[PDB]
Nucleic acid binder design. Structure first.
Ligand SMILES: [K+]
Ligand SMILES: [K+]
Ligand SMILES: [K+]
Ligand SMILES: [K+]
Ligand SMILES: [K+]
Ligand SMILES: [K+]
Ligand SMILES: [K+]
Ligand SMILES: [K+]
Ligand SMILES: [K+]
Ligand SMILES: [K+]
Ligand SMILES: [K+]
Ligand SMILES: [K+]
Ligand SMILES: [K+]
Ligand SMILES: [K+]
Ligand SMILES: [K+]
Ligand SMILES: [K+]
Ligand SMILES: [K+]
Ligand SMILES: [K+]
Ligand SMILES: [K+]
Ligand SMILES: [K+]
Ligand SMILES: [K+]
Ligand SMILES: [K+]
Ligand SMILES: [K+]
Ligand SMILES: [K+]
Ligand SMILES: [K+]
Ligand SMILES: [K+]
Ligand SMILES: [K+]
Ligand SMILES: [K+]
Ligand SMILES: [K+]
Ligand SMILES: [K+]
Ligand SMILES: [K+]
Ligand SMILES: [K+]
Ligand SMILES: [K+]
Ligand SMILES: [K+]
Ligand SMILES: [K+]
Ligand SMILES: [K+]
Ligand SMILES: [K+]
Ligand SMILES: [K+]
Ligand SMILES: [K+]
Ligand SMILES: [K+]
Ligand SMILES: [K+]
Ligand SMILES: [K+]
Ligand SMILES: [K+]
Ligand SMILES: [K+]
Ligand SMILES: [K+]
Ligand SMILES: [K+]
Ligand SMILES: [K+]
Ligand SMILES: [K+]
Ligand SMILES: [K+]
Ligand SMILES: [K+]
Ligand SMILES: [K+]
Ligand SMILES: [K+]
Ligand SMILES: [K+]
Ligand SMILES: [K+]
Ligand SMILES: [K+]
Ligand SMILES: [K+]
Ligand SMILES: [K+]
Ligand SMILES: [K+]
Ligand SMILES: [K+]
Ligand SMILES: [K+]
Ligand SMILES: [K+]
Ligand SMILES: [K+]
Ligand SMILES: [K+]
Ligand SMILES: [K+]
Ligand SMILES: [K+]
Ligand SMILES: [K+]
Ligand SMILES: [K+]
Ligand SMILES: [K+]
Ligand SMILES: [K+]
Ligand SMILES: [K+]
Ligand SMILES: [K+]
Ligand SMILES: [K+]
Ligand SMILES: [Mg+2]
Ligand SMILES: [Mg+2]
Ligand SMILES: [Mg+2]
Ligand SMILES: [Mg+2]
Ligand SMILES: [Mg+2]
Ligand SMILES: [Mg+2]
Lengths: 166, 142, 91, 37
RNA sequence: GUCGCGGCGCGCCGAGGGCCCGACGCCUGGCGGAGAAUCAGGGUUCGACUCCGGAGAGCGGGCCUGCGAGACGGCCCGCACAUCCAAGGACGGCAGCAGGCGCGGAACUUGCCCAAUGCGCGGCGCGCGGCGGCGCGACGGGGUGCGCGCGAGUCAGGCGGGCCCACCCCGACCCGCCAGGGCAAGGCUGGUGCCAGCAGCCGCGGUAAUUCCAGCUCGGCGAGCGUCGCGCGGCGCUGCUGCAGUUGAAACGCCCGUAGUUGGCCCCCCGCCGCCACGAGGAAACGGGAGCGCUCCAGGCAGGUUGGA
RNA sequence: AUCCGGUCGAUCCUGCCGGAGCGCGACGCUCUCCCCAAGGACGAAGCCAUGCAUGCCUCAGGACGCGGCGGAC
């Protein structure tokens, strides 16, 4: 067989069960307003990634406090959530992995980082400037709007010094 | 308990299930094969044939209308069916020997609405989709 | 162009060669071509540059070097098409 | 079958993110009321 | 006789062997497993094709050579089909790669290379395997602007590549498809007048139609939307978990009774099952899962003393 | 770990019919850029024109031939 038959691939979003439901059909465009979202697949994707960390946490929390699998994956899960900035330092217990939301995932996009840093007038301006290739992340130039910035790479957001803007 | 129990009754709990599944009309309809036989399409999404006559069908008891249909002779097994031509005015695009493509109404071969005896419909005539043909996106030659 | 870094040097005296990996740095400009860095990579006719690639944005390039001492080394231990892109055999 | 098609024979807004932005600002009382238009 | 055991074969002797814990027979639009689809838990359905194992080379058969074949890009014969031929004769096996016919709702080039990966023999050969072409099956990412700069294209040079190109880098120019009565988010003018037509289900239409045909307006998901067929879910309408049996469908007219299923209380500290835990031994891939910024990502196993637990 | 619409003058049920999600194919309409990638399996194990799919090295310029190993993978 050609060697390409052996590559893995996978879907990254889940579509809600009841589509035509007014109350959250409204709070769903509210999110497309408070950030610059092309369509609903980027809310679906955020729900998809929150669901998995929730499922892992419930699996671990069924278990017992002195157990090895807790001692392994709880520490791993908290470390990766803290370094992505989905969870902050003061909450170092697994039971806090349950009370997150989509919004704290959205907070660490570049479009949010540069608006905290005030590098763009707004979020829609931030989007257009992202694709114009004008903002770099620590000396390397990042074309991605959905880019997820570790709080280590979060001090080094700025204009890309090769740009019409220095 | 009106059901058998006890650690050594697995064989009976399986015999009961196997016998009682056939009392469900859907399980029997999808697993007995007599429908797979009686099905004019022989278990497919669609099939083609040649038109043998154009007919009109008088609607069922509450409504009143003359729906439009064609008697189709299937190519793959030489059977007779009737297909409802949808979408106002389309019955003109179905000549007396045409290769037409036939699919279903839904409901796995049950009559729909008020059209008696018809479980199929035509979706393409002479290589052209009838939706676009109605919508003036393609045109039959002459 | 400005910065020319060799890393992971395997002096391999079974094939009479030196393997390194070269990193070219050039903020905004280029390194000209694999014909330019040579001077810094090293004479320079015994140096085989291959497998170079740039990256998004630009500024950095990564490639691989072989250093063959003898001439028959680069006719014996070296592949063919390599030399046809090197101008040597020309066949 | 002679009455076929009787009635038939006798009868740049912005895009994507910005378009959903237009809807966002437009809505945030029916949309297609007879009153508003 | 066989490489060898064996009713494997032959002679003689006996009458055994299987079965409601489903034999035997019939049917299958039956290749098995590793696995995949669905989704609280328990489950349902499919296992064409990537790895492993089996079996075949139009269909019955027979065999030679060799360590190894009942081999079909080896031979011999019967059958069904085709081929050239001066008429006497010879000859084939694409369920190998491309391509043609036919069938069907349904599936691409009659390309270039052995440079990698492996194997053979030995520097070559290899339709393995690779590299381009066709390719909205499907997956992942980014636009159709923001308040004033870009990518999509064009032309040059690198980089890469067996030879070209695609990606990256540097120079100069520069939506659509379905709907708007309810289920279910979204409402005025003209036409038609149980007609034409809509309508998955309720229902609409009888010359003032919230539903047809149109115009305006508004809704939905969105480079993708709609229609058809099937699997899973919805379904506690198959019920082990967990349905129902007075009257809605449903307790055999009764008693006896074998197989089956079930069976009070008691001695603890022995043996033999069941059960619970922990090991040993055997395959990856997939599924999880520790670490790693292919710019992110679907990925891959990278990488800056390492690592793939 | 969710329901909904369809049996009345009105009402509570049983019970099906119909709707709402994911996946696999086929058909229709539509299509800016890049990356990944399946593709004559589906009661026709039907039939095949044309080309290619297996070669590589003891005894004399060399071929040719003999011999050998492989073609059972
Ligand atoms: K009962
Ligand atoms: K019961
Ligand atoms: K019972
Ligand atoms: K028991
Ligand atoms: K039962
Ligand atoms: K014997
Ligand atoms: K005998
Ligand atoms: K006997
Ligand atoms: K049986
Ligand atoms: K079959
Ligand atoms: K079950
Ligand atoms: K389950
Ligand atoms: K389960
Ligand atoms: K279920
Ligand atoms: K279930
Ligand atoms: K396949
Ligand atoms: K196979
Ligand atoms: K297989
Ligand atoms: K295999
Ligand atoms: K195998
Ligand atoms: K095998
Ligand atoms: K096999
Ligand atoms: K075999
Ligand atoms: K056979
Ligand atoms: K044969
Ligand atoms: K045969
Ligand atoms: K044979
Ligand atoms: K044979
Ligand atoms: K076949
Ligand atoms: K075949
Ligand atoms: K080919
Ligand atoms: K055909
Ligand atoms: K056809
Ligand atoms: K090779
Ligand atoms: K090939
Ligand atoms: K520009
Ligand atoms: K350009
Ligand atoms: K420009
Ligand atoms: K410009
Ligand atoms: K447009
Ligand atoms: K309509
Ligand atoms: K239906
Ligand atoms: K309905
Ligand atoms: K009117
Ligand atoms: K069910
Ligand atoms: K259930
Ligand atoms: K009961
Ligand atoms: K009664
Ligand atoms: K009865
Ligand atoms: K009784
Ligand atoms: K009985
Ligand atoms: K009795
Ligand atoms: K009794
Ligand atoms: K008894
Ligand atoms: K018993
Ligand atoms: K029992
Ligand atoms: K018992
Ligand atoms: K008992
Ligand atoms: K046990
Ligand atoms: K293995
Ligand atoms: K359930
Ligand atoms: K209804
Ligand atoms: K009702
Ligand atoms: K009643
Ligand atoms: K009811
Ligand atoms: K086929
Ligand atoms: K075929
Ligand atoms: K086949
Ligand atoms: K089939
Ligand atoms: K041999
Ligand atoms: K052979
Ligand atoms: K072999
Ligand atoms: Mg199987
Ligand atoms: Mg062979
Ligand atoms: Mg051929
Ligand atoms: Mg066909
Ligand atoms: Mg159920
Ligand atoms: Mg195939």
């Amino acid at each position: 067989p050609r060697i390409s038959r052996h590559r893995n691939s996978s879907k990254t979003y889940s579509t809600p069960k009841k589509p035509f439901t007014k109350p959250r059909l409204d709070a769903e465009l509210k999110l497309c307003g408070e950030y610059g979202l092309k369509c609903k697949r980027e809310i679906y994707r955020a729900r998809y990634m929150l669901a998995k960390i929730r499922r892992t946490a419930r699996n671990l929390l069924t278990l017992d406090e002195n157990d090895i699998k807790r001692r392994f994956e709880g520490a791993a899960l908290l470390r990766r959530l803290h370094m992505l900035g989905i969870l902050d330092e003061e909450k170092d217990q697994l039971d806090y992995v349950l009370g997150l939301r989509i919004e704290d995932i959205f907070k660490r996009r570049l479009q949010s980082v540069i608006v905290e840093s005030k590098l763009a007038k707004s979020v829609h301006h931030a989007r257009n400037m992202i694709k114009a290739r004008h903002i770099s992340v620590g000396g390397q130039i990042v074309n991605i709007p959905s880019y997820m910035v570790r709080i280590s790479n979060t001090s080094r957001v700025a204009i890309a010094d090769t740009s019409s803007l220095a | 308990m009106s059901k058998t129990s006890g650690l050594y009754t697995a064989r009976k709990l399986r015999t009961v299930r196997r016998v009682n599944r056939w009392a469900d009309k859907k399980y029997r309809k999808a697993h007995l094969g007599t429908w797979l036989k009686a099905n004019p399409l022989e278990g497919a999404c669609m099939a083609r044939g040649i038109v043998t006559q154009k007919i009109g069908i008088s609607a069922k008891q509450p409504n009143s209308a003359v729906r439009k249909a064609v008697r189709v002779q299937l190519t793959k097994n030489s059977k007779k069916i009737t297909a409802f031509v949808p979408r106002d005015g389309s019955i003109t695009y179905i000549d007396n020997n045409d290769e037409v493509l036939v699919a279903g109404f839904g409901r796995a071969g049950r009559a729909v609405g008020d059209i008696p005896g018809c479980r199929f419909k035509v979706i393409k005539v002479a290589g052209i989709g009838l939706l676009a043909l109605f919508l003036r996106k393609r045109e039959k030659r002459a | 162009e400005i910065t020319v870094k060799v890393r992971k040097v395997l002096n391999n005296p079974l094939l009479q060669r030196q393997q390194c990996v070269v990193d070219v740095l050039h903020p905004g400009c280029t390194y000209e071509s694999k014909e330019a860095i040579k001077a810094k990579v090293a004479d320079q006719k015994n140096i085989v540059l291959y497998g170079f690639k740039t990256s998004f944005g630009g500024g950095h390039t990564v490639g691989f070097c072989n250093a063959y001492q003898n001439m028959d080394a680069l006719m014996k231990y070296e592949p063919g098409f390599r030399k046809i892109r090197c101008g040597l055999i020309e066949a | 079958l002679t009455s076929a098609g009787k009635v038939r024979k006798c009868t740049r807004p912005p895009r994507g993110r910005a378009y959903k932005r237009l809807l966002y600002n437009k809505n945030f009382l029916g949309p297609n009321n007879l009153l508003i238009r």
